[PDB]
């Protein structure tokens, strides 16, 4: 994702970040990045064990998950780097443990994270859950971090509100995009010049890198080699994502046998547990609850003390 972003925010607009408890998310439908998720568990039954437990915990608290997979990757920086020099096995093994638990899944046209955002900004889901701030760049209004952490690591989930970020940094999404790029995008090389906090300011009185470059120009702050500061700025805007409305996710009922006969058996693992597990998942069948006033009254604005 984007480099030093979380810190930048934390350090200049903490009002857009909250440290809530996993419980407060009861009734929320969230878009997850299966790829990264599946990875997190590894770093070989883990790609599914965590894909198991965690999703149970996410269910137990009322959170309704929708795992997402990536399709045909695009032009990522280090991505096509070895190309300057010239599997899905344990991946789909998950796209199974899911529907066998009654948990949705979607094949993103490319980068899931972008798709996740795609959803979130369509009311189809609450927030996007990844570890990479990218989602924010892609225009996602709400991003939840740590929702896939171990039951142990007592880390609370970290929420981020794009519309609050944009608020403080006084800059449109696009204007925010350039910031992420100059902050350290994983799509193109940043500019050795500007610093985390520095990069902000420039963007603040130069609503684009295109204007930031022509300004500072000495050989004291040179602009990258093959700088695609453009191509990127585009992706973060109009990515490749499956239409939101295209489908309706529906959490089904877990199939104890069919699944336990494809887990503790075919993949060998303590039966007693994966049984009480499927049991618990079956219990926590729901989440949505208590409405907000927003849900019925338009927000007037803000009264500020004299």
């Amino acid at each position: 994702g984007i480099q030093g972003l979380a810190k930048l925010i934390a350090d200049v607009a903490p009002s857009a970040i909250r440290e809530n408890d996993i419980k407060s998310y009861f009734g929320r439908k969230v878009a997850i990045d299966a790829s990264m998720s599946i990875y997190q568990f590894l770093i070989t039954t883990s790609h599914l064990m965590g894909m198991f437990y965690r999703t149970i915990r996410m269910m137990e608290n009322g959170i309704k998950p929708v795992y997402v997979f990536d399709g045909k990757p695009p032009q990522l920086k280090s991505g096509e780097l070895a190309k300057r020099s010239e599997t899905k096995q344990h991946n789909d093994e998950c796209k199974h443990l899911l529907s066998l638990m009654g948990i949705p899944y979607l094949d993103a046209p490319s980068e899931a994270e972008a798709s996740c955002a795609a959803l979130v900004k369509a009311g189809k889901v609450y927030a996007a859950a990844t570890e990479d701030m990218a989602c924010l760049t892609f225009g996602s209004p709400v991003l939840m971090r740590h929702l896939t952490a171990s039951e142990a690591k007592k880390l609370p989930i970290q929420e981020f509100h794009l519309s609050r970020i944009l608020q403080e940094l006084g800059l449109n999404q696009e204007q925010f995009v350039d910031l992420c790029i100059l902050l350290g995008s994983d799509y193109c090389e940043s500019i050795r010049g500007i610093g985390p906090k520095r990069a902000v300011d420039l963007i603040q009185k130069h609503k684009s890198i295109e204007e930031i470059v022509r300004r500072l120009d000495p050989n004291k702050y040179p602009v990258p080699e093959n700088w695609l500061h453009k191509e990127a700025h585009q992706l973060f805007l109009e990515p490749e994502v499956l239409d939101p409305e295209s489908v309706e996710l529906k959490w089904s009922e877990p199939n104890e046998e069919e699944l336990i006969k494809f887990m503790c058996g075919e993949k060998q693992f303590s039966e007693e547990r994966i049984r009480s597990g499927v049991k618990r998942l079956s219990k926590s069948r729901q989440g949505s609850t208590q409405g907000r006033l927003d849900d019925f009254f338009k927000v007037t604005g803000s009264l500020s003390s004299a």
Partner: protein, 251 residues
């Protein structure tokens, strides 16, 4: 230069006693219509609208549309230092960011003159919708508080069924199910369930305990509900104006 008086001044003690357990701050909008307060809750479920007209006051001088902010519980701790027969007076300068409270005595021998400093505010503000409320119930406030507290020892959230003959306050709990039925009674102790179409809704009983903190605040309590909308409980602050608590409904 804001300078206002209130002789039967126990109502201010009474409103801020029912304000401080809900919310930690308030956006005090002083207009020439009087003293107003729209403010959300802290849990993003509820809201307070306080309106105090000028004609419910005694003596009045408003020269500014003041928009200030009060930290509520320290102000309540200061309001705990005056009796209920005592006259409450407020003074405010539009450049001096402080509140000068003057507590007169009914025998005028004890004078109090307290001062609370100001803090800045950028509070959110949303507008309530105006609509048709399919059930408006006039009730005694003490009986209402008694009933919802009697339900508090069963479970946590309440289900309501509002219909023609009776109204049905039901709940579950760790000891099982229960429900109490009410009907109209054929000026303060009179009830009335005015109804067009029967409904069923879910609400939080703990927020009803929070809303019944204004039990001594009116003659009668009004309960206004419709389908999938914020319940508005109304305490008509007698001869003064009214306090309305909105509760966004549950799903």
């Amino acid at each position: 230069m804001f300078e206002a008086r209130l002789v039967q001044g126990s109502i201010l003690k009474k409103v801020l006693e029912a304000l401080k357990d809900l919310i930690n701050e308030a956006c005090w909008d002083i207009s020439s219509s009087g003293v107003n307060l729209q403010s959300m809750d802290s849990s993003h479920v509820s809201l307070v609208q306080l309106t105090l007209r000028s004609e419910g006051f005694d003596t009045y001088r408003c020269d500014r549309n003041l928009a200030m902010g009060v930290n509520l519980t320290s102000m309540s701790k200061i309001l705990k230092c005056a009796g209920n027969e005592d006259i409450i007076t407020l003074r405010a300068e539009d450049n001096a960011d402080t509140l000068a409270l003057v507590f007169e005595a009914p025998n005028q021998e004890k004078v109090s003159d307290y001062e609370m400093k100001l803090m800045d505010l950028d509070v959110e503000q949303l507008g309530i919708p105006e609509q048709e409320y399919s059930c408006v119930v006039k009730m005694p406030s003490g009986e209402f508080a008694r009933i919802c507290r009697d339900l508090s020892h069963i479970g946590d959230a309440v289900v309501i069924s509002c219909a023609k003959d009776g109204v049905k306050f039901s709940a579950s709990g760790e000891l099982g199910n229960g429900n109490i039925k009410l009907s109209q009674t054929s000026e303060e102790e009179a009830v009335t369930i005015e109804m067009n179409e029967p409904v069923q809704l879910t609400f939080a009983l703990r927020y009803l305990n929070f809303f019944t903190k204004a039990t001594p605040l009116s003659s009668t309590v009004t309960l206004s509900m419709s389908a999938d909308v914020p319940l508005v409980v109304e305490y008509k602050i007698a001869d003064m104006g009214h306090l309305k608590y909105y509760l966004a409904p549950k799903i």
